[PDB]
Amino acid sequence: EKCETIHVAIVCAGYNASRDVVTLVKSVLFHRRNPLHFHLIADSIAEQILATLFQTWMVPAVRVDFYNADELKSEVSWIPNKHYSGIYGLMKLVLTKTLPANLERVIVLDTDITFATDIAELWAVFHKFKGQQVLGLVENQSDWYLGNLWKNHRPWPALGRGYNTGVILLLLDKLRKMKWEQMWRLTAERELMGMLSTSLADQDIFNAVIKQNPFLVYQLPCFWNVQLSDHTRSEQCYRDVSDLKVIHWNSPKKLRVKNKHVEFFRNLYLTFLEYDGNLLRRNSENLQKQLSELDEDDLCYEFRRERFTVHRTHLYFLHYEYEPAADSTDVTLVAQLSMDRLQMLEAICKHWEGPISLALYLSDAEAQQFLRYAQGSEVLMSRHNVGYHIVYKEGQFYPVNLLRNVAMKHISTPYMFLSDIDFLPMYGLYEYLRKSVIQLDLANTKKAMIVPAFETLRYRLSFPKSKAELLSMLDMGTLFTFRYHVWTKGHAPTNFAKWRTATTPYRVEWEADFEPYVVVRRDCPEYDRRFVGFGWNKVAHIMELDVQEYEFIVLPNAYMIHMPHAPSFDITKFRSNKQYRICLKTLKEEFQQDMSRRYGFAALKYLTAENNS
Amino acid sequence: EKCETIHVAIVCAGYNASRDVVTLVKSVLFHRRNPLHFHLIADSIAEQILATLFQTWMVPAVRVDFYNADELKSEVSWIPNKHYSGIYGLMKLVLTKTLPANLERVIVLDTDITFATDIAELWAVFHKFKGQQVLGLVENQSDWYLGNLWKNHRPWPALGRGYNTGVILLLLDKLRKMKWEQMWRLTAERELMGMLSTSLADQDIFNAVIKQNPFLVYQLPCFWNVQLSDHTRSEQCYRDVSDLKVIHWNSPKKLRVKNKHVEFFRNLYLTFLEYDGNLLRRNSENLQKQLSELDEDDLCYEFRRERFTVHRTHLYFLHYEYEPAADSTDVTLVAQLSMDRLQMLEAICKHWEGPISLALYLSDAEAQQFLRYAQGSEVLMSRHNVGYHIVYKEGQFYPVNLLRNVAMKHISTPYMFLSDIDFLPMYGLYEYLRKSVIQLDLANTKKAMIVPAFETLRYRLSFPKSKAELLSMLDMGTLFTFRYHVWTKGHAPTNFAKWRTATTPYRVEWEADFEPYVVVRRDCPEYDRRFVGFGWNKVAHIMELDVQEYEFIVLPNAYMIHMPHAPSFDITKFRSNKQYRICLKTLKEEFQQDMSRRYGFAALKYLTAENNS
Ligand SMILES: [Mn+2]
Ligand SMILES: [Mn+2]
Ligand SMILES: [Mn+2]
Numbered sequence A, B: 001e002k003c004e005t006i007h008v009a010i011v012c013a014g015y016n017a018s019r020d021v022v023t024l025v026k027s028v029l030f031h032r033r034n035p036l037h038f039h040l041i042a043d044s045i046a047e048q049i050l051a052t053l054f055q056t057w058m059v060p061a062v063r064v065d066f067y068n069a070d071e072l073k074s075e076v077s078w079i080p081n082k083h084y085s086g087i088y089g090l091m092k093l094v095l096t097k098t099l100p101a102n103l104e105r106v107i108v109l110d111t112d113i114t115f116a117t118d119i120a121e122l123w124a125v126f127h128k129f130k131g132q133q134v135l136g137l138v139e140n141q142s143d144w145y146l147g148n149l150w151k152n153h154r155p156w157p158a159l160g161r162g163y164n165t166g167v168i169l170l171l172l173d174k175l176r177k178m179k180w181e182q183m184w185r186l187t188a189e190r191e192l193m194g195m196l197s198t199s200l201a202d203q204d205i206f207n208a209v210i211k212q213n214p215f216l217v218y219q220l221p222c223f224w225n226v227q228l229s230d231h232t233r234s235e236q237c238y239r240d241v242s243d244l245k246v247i248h249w250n251s252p253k254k255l256r257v258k259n260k261h262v263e264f265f266r267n268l269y270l271t272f273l274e275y276d277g278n279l280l281r282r283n284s285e286n287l288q289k290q291l292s293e294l295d296e297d298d299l300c301y302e303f304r305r306e307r308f309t310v311h312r313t314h315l316y317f318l319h320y321e322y323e324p325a326a327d328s329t330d331v332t333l334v335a336q337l338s339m340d341r342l343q344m345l346e347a348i349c350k351h352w353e354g355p356i357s358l359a360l361y362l363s364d365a366e367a368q369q370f371l372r373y374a375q376g377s378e379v380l381m382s383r384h385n386v387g388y389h390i391v392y393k394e395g396q397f398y399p400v401n402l403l404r405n406v407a408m409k410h411i412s413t414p415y416m417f418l419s420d421i422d423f424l425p426m427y428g429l430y431e432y433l434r435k436s437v438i439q440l441d442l443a444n445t446k447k448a449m450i451v452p453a454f455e456t457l458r459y460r461l462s463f464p465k466s467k468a469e470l471l472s473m474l475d476m477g478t479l480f481t482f483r484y485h486v487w488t489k490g491h492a493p494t495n496f497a498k499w500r501t502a503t504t505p506y507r508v509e510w511e512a513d514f515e516p517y518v519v520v521r522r523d524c525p526e527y528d529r530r531f532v533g534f535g536w537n538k539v540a541h542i543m544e545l546d547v548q549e550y551e552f553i554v555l556p557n558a559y560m561i562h563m564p565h566a567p568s569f570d571i572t573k574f575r576s577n578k579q580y581r582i583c584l585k586t587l588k589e590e591f592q593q594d595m596s597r598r599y600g601f602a603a604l605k606y607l608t609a610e611n612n613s
């Protein structure tokens, strides 16, 4: 009917799979022509990642339904397995019970597949099933089951070379009809009485129920999944580029394998592993209705256009693991960055010790480059507790607030710290703020902690170690208060003069254009989307913290030393475009009046200050 | 007939059209199934750009043939024109005179089209013509020809709304048998006596050729040429997404046109242009049979493969121009730059008055980012004499020598200066180099000039004026010799102590690891490709240029000072693994041996040095 709403099922388990299903879905969608409907069996972490990802793509004619695996985990718990994927591999057979009875046919695909062609043609194979051919599989393209690869090998019984369950084409309705659960269960225990465990997890069990009843299978043509292993024989299963339709990269080495034409296959792989998904995307009604009233005649309307724009967010790109402590007083950094500021990560990785978040902002190709880089550095790899929240590129402006609030919402500790990637904290600051949070006891009251700012110009500076050493180095003064020659009010209002002699934190009121760096509990407000780029950005958040009656505490025994960095493009554009400035000022008026409306008299002070200045 | 052949013809003229032709070509190829054969009616400049572009793509099943336009410019010169394209617009009318009778039918697309579907489908309409209908066309979507858009409008006579020449589908074989040449010439002569000149150039005349014989034309489907302008009713001519196959941009605004659903058109415009064209590759056999015997087990397999590679080069990305001078001594810088370091491009431009030829290294998607940036900054626009040679990304290493060579060969003056964009010359270095070239009289001999290298470690410094002031800052301790803390041997042989008191140029011999910056004639040897990446990318060229009996001169009254910069991944990979260092060393002995072999005893000198060290 040209629109049958093709149905798919994918097993996701672990962060690696969570991030490989992205590539598989890219491959399927690239050649799509009719509506799709996925069905991802996911654990909690994969559930969150993929929920956010798909809810952010805004794909058309595509739907996503997530099925819990924790409840269905026990079903196969009695089947020992040895596959590197884990116990989640076997579960690809319980789909009949898990999926709804109202569905008929699903292309069960493993994560690593990649389709070079539309899945419509593969779906078409559902018009060639005859007799009691209810499953759909392909002949194995290896010698694993033949029992001749090496001496003393005892593969589980199978028909000829065996089959690889990379792609399965099912008739759910039928399997439900003829009592599918019990016979495969019976075969399962029947084939486990003699030996220890399976060798390929689900792939093994299916082969059993393939061998015992050979009238269910349907020997699809070999070129539906060109299995590539260390002993591949796909050369006879393809002749040219056009014939290939689908690939399976079954190897622990993955991309390090060697073949006669591995170059072309790898090039194709990178074609879609690097394709700009933000282009494939062609909640919706409200979004479009907001887009309706939008006017193109405003000075900086584009700020309004970008205020509510939705960007593809792929949360937790790389592995992440964290065990919360009993104290319940942890802190985690957050920061935006792009290419120009990557190098600082190592430095920050050499500074922090606890978890940090990061709203890393790159295109797809730069995202893969970062993947390689983070897979290279030993310091990054050894650090488990560093999240990597990716927000892909789109539009022209820089949605910095979007990046920082995306990093805000997803944190695994109660309190948090706001900064930028440039700043480099102390050594041991993690324990310092641990003790400080414990002592000031913010678990009850409402307070903010500020770490003062600075800036130096000695690239090869020895890392200071003690407050008294900073006193000596300021008496000599090699580095100065951050932005001491452009924006004195940025951090001068901290009144550094009294900082020196202090031994305990001191409170400070608000001042014109006061934009410190704060530590605060998670409840602190998100940023205002109206402002994208550089300029008058943090001070909005500061205004909200202040107007919520947050007392500003400045920590005595900490500080930050800006590591010099090259100028970026946002600052140059801000300093060059006057229209940017005037529309920023009108946005200032708008924000101030909205603040007044939402709180009332208390917010008038800012206005009065603007009237006084 | 199952990939019989697809033929196409494109008119190219002026620098502003090469980019358009490349985007159109990638758009067409994105949906290809059959082999393709392009005929580019091109001028000298377009010929020069596109020859190398297509010779470097290495696309399969594609043949490119260039037809000169300078010889055939006069054929239509007698026909006045007012279209923004110019005289070349009429060139679409005399293809039969150009294209040999060996061909019978060929599409003709203006450079701005962007097919959204396979061109084979369009080619299919060459079996649906009846009798004598040779020329195929589509209806104009405007009301220009109807003479009702505005008062006092007198467009050339036409049938109905008129037809647009955006896409032409010819049947040349009949069009020659009809004596088309005399017919259109007479029609034009008749239609030029009364009015002043043509309005739409070729589209203004073809329509008349239709009217005077209404039964030639084939009225194609309207949804082929969806012209987008200020007076379009295409919403009637297009219904859905599947109702779109080929788009045109018929307004000087181009990117700044407005429509009801323009969002999808903009998406369809960025969908192909954004594509990384290096993934479309699915003089050649030589490359294959060198790649054949690259031992995978060899420690330099990746290096060996990389060196022979060919990269997509798009010479003269932006407008270029140069008025030759009678001095015949002009110099032109060269540099290798990437986007992680693009920021200081203006920096070099403020310090150069004469022509300079860069060599960027960009990603297509972000190549357009660079296009926008260059079109924004007024400093670059003010200067017409700057080249921009983009060699797109490919692979993992950094073929810097490729960038340098691409900038070497294509230079409009006989003399050149080699440096890096990460450096910076004095004010007036161009004039001083001119004087030195005309004075030392290098017009005959094989000598080179060297400009000394320093470095600074503070972002914000004033720009010196004279040599005395330079040495003043130097002795203040704010400046040092370039690489005076890691690689001292790079520039030490210049023994700046001697230069300080210098008043006339002085010669020097070679020293260990001596890597100056040279000003040289254009015959100096190409950079050795065997070394790729960062590190020992230049001293090899120096030892190549020294063994060849080139004397060295160090200019007394010139300098050039380094501006601090952050690191990149190339240095990280240079310090990452020992295998890279081992392969580097292997390439080292190979270079020594081969340079000896080609020159012999003279080489032993360098060898002896490495024996001593
Ligand atoms: Mn597998
Ligand atoms: Mn900064
Ligand atoms: Mn046009």
Ligand SMILES: [Mn+2]
Residues within 6 Å of the ligand: B422, B565
């Ligand atoms: Mn450098």
